[PDB]
Design a protein around this nucleic acid. Structure first.
Length: 830
RNA sequence: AAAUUAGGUGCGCUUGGCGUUUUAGUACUCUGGAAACAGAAUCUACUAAAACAAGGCAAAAUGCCGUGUUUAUCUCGUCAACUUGUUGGCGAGAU
DNA sequence: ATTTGAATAGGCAAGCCAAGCGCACCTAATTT
DNA sequence: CTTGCCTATTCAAAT
């Protein structure tokens, strides 16, 4: 509308805050938040890594099948050939001297092609007992094969150590080719095979694609978002800049073109990096707090808690005034704090820097004499007690070694340039007011370009991440995630009011112009007065009508299910159950088995099936009951792993134990991949696409549509009709039932008059849906209350449920009760 | 703006050993037998073969795709798509 | 008066890591 | 760290 305004933006990892304020009065017009999932690099790294793995496995399978065809052609393999009980390690070692049978020969060649070593690993010739190192293993093996073939070494381990496969099974392809050439040299005599056979086979065995070959044949008005794709960014940042642009486009359409935009990109790059910094900061804070506590313990002076900054500076400065180099006794500082003042190294009026790096603890008299001068200017004047040269030496000494000063502080202390030069002031302004990061520069260049071309008088600006926090401290406005997502929005409104301060104060005109990248304060009290409490912060703080817009995901063909495979079993009561496994039996702090034996001995399969080994294990648990892991003591004291019961003490070690786990309900059945499987083979965690609510004779009901239920066709996805009608039948949804709505992740749902956002279907069977709150996470809602419930909301949809309505927000967070189509969606072109 | 050295961020490609699971064999257990061995059990271990996001192509091939990005809703107009009455683009409106 | 079913609280588990390559753009230092 | 989903515990309604 006609009225002119400013647009604040607080860009973040998961959020874009926005604030809109009247250009004349500085009253709040509007304010809201646009929330999204952080775009993690892990996600695509996953997709790529799995695409790599799928090709590796495809190519192994295809190599084995190319070998078979060659054996069919030279009439060494048939449809009706028994390869079943032929140990290929025996057949490899035998065939380097004597005649193999056609079957042994086929067994051997097929075993080689399956597993054929690395081709791109050179000797390190070093051994630091690293099991997982390929280079160290390849080398250890190269030494073992000085006089023998791979199959000779492999058969030796099979007989001595009882096993072959594992980490030590890492050999060079050239070591394998040396064997194959010999095998084929011997066997060429007795079998009819020619140099064409031998050449073909070794090619199959040794050959692979290069990085520069890659796959085979088939393989693949308003501000635009395509310009973000041009200049390269972190995915986390790249998402936010696309979100931000669409939030600017929506504000422009509604309210018209802003006079001024001003932007703040968050400090942190991702949540983890932030956590690390926070941890580092907390680590730093703890040290200061411990010292403060020590001071209070030793001196009894409680006022130390109010002199944190002075004490920090005191310790930093070895208890000396940096201008006079006279001692600041800690006791005197505590008793007479007014004798010592915190001074800005570079006058705040020039640098706009209020950071700890621009602060020093000095005597009140020295502070008065320095005035609005740098240490260099002051110490070069007739007013100083010491020479600049003496000062400089001291600072340089402080910078080298223990009790160090930051680089930035050192530079400020040793600033010799003329403060009064525009170029120097520009440098300070750019450092303190204007954000200097490749992304932030990239964004404002995108925007400024856009407005320039289309001839729209819009002043894009930026402010430093730190700066907002200063104003919060200044105007007594405590930041806290506690409250909810609103903090992001009330950051935006602050940013927007800083713009008002950098327009109404003619004394900030230079700073304003610098921030607008346009081509070209005498006292501390004056500086302080410019930024004083407006009254309009009461408006910001007391404001209520915030708006939230969570983004809704409708993408088909996301992760369908979990990777892991599970066997099943029918128990005594005739309930199919997942089989679990206890691994890591001989670990110091592992109480899993000891807990299981005391609670539920009948859950072990060996309880039923190997009673003698069970009784043998129980005597150990009784022997070393007092410890966490009885088996650890068994291994420590005797020096021998637990073996299966046997009459002659020749049973194998026990390394995993299978026991009956949860009952089987919601699963994916993969048992047809395993011909003649006695039990059932399954996968778990059917991941949801959406759920479709129906109103049936006054009863609310719903169907879960799984991602498994959605199938790619030519250029579109289709919800499977048979799976869908089957699903309705298990839910007993009539043919005369009205479709109400479909709910995707983060879709908004009003259940019995209470609005939430959808997470998913907790239990299809019990008819429960997991939701979350809108303005705050339910976790945090409980924390601020100090409640100790589980931090998850579940809602049952039942005969008791009275109304279900779907809502929707625009990108700005304007809320709408929305209409639905008459039927569910089946086709999805996007 | 270029060069040199060191690191980073990202996209993509090529491999290797494993891991999970089934079937078989062998060892372990039980029964019978002078013994070879036959049967029972499917528990613990090794070896082989096979499957590993559900699937979809392709057809002797160093064969190919399947977990990312973009994504408020509904109506009307228009262009298109294949699924032939729906859902994509563009425009307009409402929520 | 006791037993059966709904709702809420409590809790578990989720494929991995080592070798190589290209290209892209950024930063820092130094010189022009 | 979040989510799909099972188990166990506690209270009210029905035989």
């Amino acid at each position: 509308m006609k009225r002119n305004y400013i647009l604040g933006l607080d860009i973040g990892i998961t959020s874009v805050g926005y604030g809109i304020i009247d250009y004349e009065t500085r009253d709040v017009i509007d304010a809201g938040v646009r929330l999204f999932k952080e775009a993690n690099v892990e996600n695509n790294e996953g997709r790529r890594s799995k695409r790599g793995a799928r090709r590796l496995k495809r190519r192994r399978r295809h190599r084995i099948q190319r070998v078979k065809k060659l054996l069919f052609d030279y009439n060494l393999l048939t449809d009706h050939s028994e390869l079943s009980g032929i140990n290929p390690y025996e057949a490899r070692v035998k065939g380097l001297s004597q005649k193999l049978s056609e079957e042994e020969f086929s067994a051997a060649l097929l075993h080689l092609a399956k597993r054929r070593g690395v081709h791109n690993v050179n000797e390190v010739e070093e051994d630091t007992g690293n099991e997982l190192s390929t280079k160290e293993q390849i080398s250890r093996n190269s030494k073992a094969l000085e006089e023998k073939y791979v199959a000779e070494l492999q058969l030796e381990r099979l007989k001595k150590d009882g096993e072959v496969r594992g980490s030590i099974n890492r050999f060079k392809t050239s070591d394998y080719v040396k064997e194959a050439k010999q095998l084929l040299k011997v066997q060429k005599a007795y079998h009819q095979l020619d140099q064409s056979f031998i050449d073909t086979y070794i090619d199959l065995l040794e050959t692979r694609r290069t990085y520069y070959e890659g796959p085979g044949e088939g393989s693949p008005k308003e501000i635009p978002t395509t310009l973000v794709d041009d200049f390269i960014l972190s995915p986390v940042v790249k998402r936010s800049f696309i979100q931000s642009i669409k939030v600017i486009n929506a504000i422009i359409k509604k309210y018209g073109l802003p006079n001024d935009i001003i932007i703040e990109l968050a400090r942190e790059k991702n949540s983890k990096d932030a956590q690390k910094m926070i941890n580092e900061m907390q680590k730093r804070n703890r040290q200061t707090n411990e010292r403060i506590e020590e001071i209070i313990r030793t001196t009894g002076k409680e006022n130390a808690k109010y002199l944190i900054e002075k004490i920090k500076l005191h310790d930093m400065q070895e208890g000396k005034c940096l201008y006079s180099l006279e001692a600041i006794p800690l006791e005197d500082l505590l008793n007479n704090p007014f004798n010592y003042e915190v001074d800005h190294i570079i006058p705040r009026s020039v640098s706009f820097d209020n950071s700890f790096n621009n602060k020093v603890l000095v005597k009140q008299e020295e502070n008065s004499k320095k005035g609005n001068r740098t240490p260099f200017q002051y110490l070069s004047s007739s007013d100083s007690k010491i020479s600049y040269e003496t000062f400089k030496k001291h600072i340089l000494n402080l910078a080298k070694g223990k009790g160090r000063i930051s680089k930035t502080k050192k530079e400020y202390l040793l600033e010799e340039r003329d403060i009064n030069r525009f170029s120097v002031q520009k440098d300070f302004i750019n450092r303190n007011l204007v954000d200097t990061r490749y992304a932030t520069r990239g964004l404002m260049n995108l925007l400024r370009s856009y407005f320039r071309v289309n001839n729209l008088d819009v002043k894009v600006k930026s402010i430093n991440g730190g700066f907002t926090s200063f104003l919060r401290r200044k105007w007594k406005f405590k930041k806290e995630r506690n409250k909810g997502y609103k903090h992001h929005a009330e950051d935006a409104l602050i940013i927007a009011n800083a713009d008002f301060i950098f327009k109404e104060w003619k004394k900030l005109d230079k700073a304003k112009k610098v921030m607008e990248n346009q081509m070209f304060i005498e006292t501390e009290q004056e500086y302080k007065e410019i930024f004083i409490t407006p009254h309009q912060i009461k408006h910001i703080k007391d404001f209520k009508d915030y708006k939230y817009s969570h983004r809704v995901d409708k993408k088909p063909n996301r992760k369908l299910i979990n990777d892991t495979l599970y066997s099943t079993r029918k128990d005594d009561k005739g309930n199919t159950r997942i089989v679990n496994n206890l691994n890591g039996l001989y670990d110091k702090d592992n109480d899993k088995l000891k807990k299981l034996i005391n609670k539920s001995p009948e859950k072990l399969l060996m309880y039923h099936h190997d009673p003698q080994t069970y009784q043998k294990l129980k005597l150990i648990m009784e022997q070393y009951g007092d410890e966490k892991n009885p088996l650890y003591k068994y291994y420590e004291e005797t020096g021998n792993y637990l073996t299966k019961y046997s009459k002659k003490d020749n049973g194998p070690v026990i390394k995993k134990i299978k026991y009956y786990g949860n009952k089987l309900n919601a699963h994916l059945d993969i048992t047809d991949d395993y011909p003649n499987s006695r039990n059932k083979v399954v996968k778990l965690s059917l991941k949801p696409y959406r759920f479709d609510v129906y109103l049936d004779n006054g009863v609310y009901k719903f169907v879960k549509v799984n991602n498994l239920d959605v199938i790619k066709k030519e250029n579109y996805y289709e919800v499977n009709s048979k799976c869908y009608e089957e699903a309705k039948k298990l839910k007993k949804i009539s043919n005369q039932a009205e479709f109400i709505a479909s709910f995707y992740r983060n879709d908004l749902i009003k259940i019995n008059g209470e609005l939430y956002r959808v997470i998913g279907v907790a239990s299809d069977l019990l008819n429960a849906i997991e939701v979350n709150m809108i303005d705050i996470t339910y976790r945090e809602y409980l924390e601020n209350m100090n409640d100790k419930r589980p931090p998850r909301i579940f809602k049952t949809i039942s005969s008791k449920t009275q109304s279900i309505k779907k809502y929707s927000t625009d990108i700005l967070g304007n809320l709408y009760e929305v209409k639905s189509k008459k039927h569910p969606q089946i086709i999805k072109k996007g």
